[PDB]
Amino acid sequence: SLTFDHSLEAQWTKWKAMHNRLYGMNEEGWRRAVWEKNMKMIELHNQEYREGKHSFTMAMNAFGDMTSEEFRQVMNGFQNRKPRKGKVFQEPLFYEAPRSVDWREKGYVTPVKNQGQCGSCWAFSATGALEGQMFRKTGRLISLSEQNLVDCSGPQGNEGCNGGLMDYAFQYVQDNGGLDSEESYPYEATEESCKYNPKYSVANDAGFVDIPKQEKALMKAVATVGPISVAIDAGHESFLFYKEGIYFEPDCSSEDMDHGVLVVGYGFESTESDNNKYWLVKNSWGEEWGMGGYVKMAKDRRNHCGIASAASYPTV
Numbered sequence: 001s002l003t004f005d006h007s008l009e010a011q012w013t014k015w016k017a018m019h020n021r022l023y024g025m026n027e028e029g030w031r032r033a034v035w036e037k038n039m040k041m042i043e044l045h046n047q048e049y050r051e052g053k054h055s056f057t058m059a060m061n062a063f064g065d066m067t068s069e070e071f072r073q074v075m076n077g078f079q080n081r082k083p084r085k086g087k088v089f090q091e092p093l094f095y096e097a098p099r100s101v102d103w104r105e106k107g108y109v110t111p112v113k114n115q116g117q118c119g120s121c122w123a124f125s126a127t128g129a130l131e132g133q134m135f136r137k138t139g140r141l142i143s144l145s146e147q148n149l150v151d152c153s154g155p156q157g158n159e160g161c162n163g164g165l166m167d168y169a170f171q172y173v174q175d176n177g178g179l180d181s182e183e184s185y186p187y188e189a190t191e192e193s194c195k196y197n198p199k200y201s202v203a204n205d206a207g208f209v210d211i212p213k214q215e216k217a218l219m220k221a222v223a224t225v226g227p228i229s230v231a232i233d234a235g236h237e238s239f240l241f242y243k244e245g246i247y248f249e250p251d252c253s254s255e256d257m258d259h260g261v262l263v264v265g266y267g268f269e270s271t272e273s274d275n276n277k278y279w280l281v282k283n284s285w286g287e288e289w290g291m292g293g294y295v296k297m298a299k300d301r302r303n304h305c306g307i308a309s310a311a312s313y314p315t316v
Contacts, residue, residue, distance in 0.1 A: 045058045058243050108135045110128075112293030142203075
């Protein structure tokens with residue numbers, strides 16, 4: 001036996017139900033212990049927040065019974081490499097970007113998606129950037145297939161649920177001459193045989209453009225292009241259970257990134273004191289995570305979590 005907290009009994013039971021957990025064997029006991037440890041950690045963070053020590057709060061979610069190490073292995077699939085250079089981003093002549101930008105309100109972004117238990121984040125970051133560029137070009141927003149990328153981009157260097165790169169996904173669309181719609185080739189959250197059919201293709205691209213490793217450059221790119229694919233260090237428990245506010249983690253790395261996401265804007269928050277700037281980011285862990293699936297990440301704080309280190313978008 002172990003010292004399970006009797007006052008958490010009801011919550012544990014309801015949590016398992018709301019997330020349809022089926023354990024058995026011996027697993028229920030140790031999963032409950034992982035969940036209770038995560039719960040205490042969330043409570044400590046929020047207490048410290050009330051004491052003025054953090055700029056964001058945390059909350060229990062569908063990842064409650066997982067260790068950070070287990071989560072990182074199953075979920076975070078960005079390879080953190082740059083095999084081939086893309087086009088050079090040419091900043092506009094004598095241009096100053098607006099103080100805030102939100103592409104969601106301009107019709108460039110589809111609803112939040114969920115990668116499930118698969119390291120396919122690279123695919124979601126890629127379709128998000130392509131969706132924005134197709135909208136810029138045609139005025140039509142259509143959700144694209146991540147499954148198509150998972151199943152068919154092996155030749156380009158991607159490895160399905162084991163990881164990949166957004167740049168490899170962009171290269172596949174060019175090589176292949178198209179990409180099917182989400183509707184015609186739905187997500188299964190597992191690698192299967194390629195089933196690409198040109199009859200249902202609704203997008204195309206002719207390469208990709210790279211953004212320099214500078215937050216000022218990334219701000220100008222977001223302002224003049226639309227949503228941009230980026231990668232960040234999402235391996236900390238503070239990120240796994242993020243709820244709301246501006247995310248800032250002292251232990252984040254600007255060199256070691258493992259999760260591909262999408263920057264859809266940027267902005268600021270102010271008081272007589274201070275809080276400051278942020279990047280508006282769309283995640284692929286469903287709507288129950290963070291702010292309806294989004295997170296505000298610290299901006300202009302020495303490339304926090306490597307947000308400006310692996311940025312690029314597709315040429316349509």
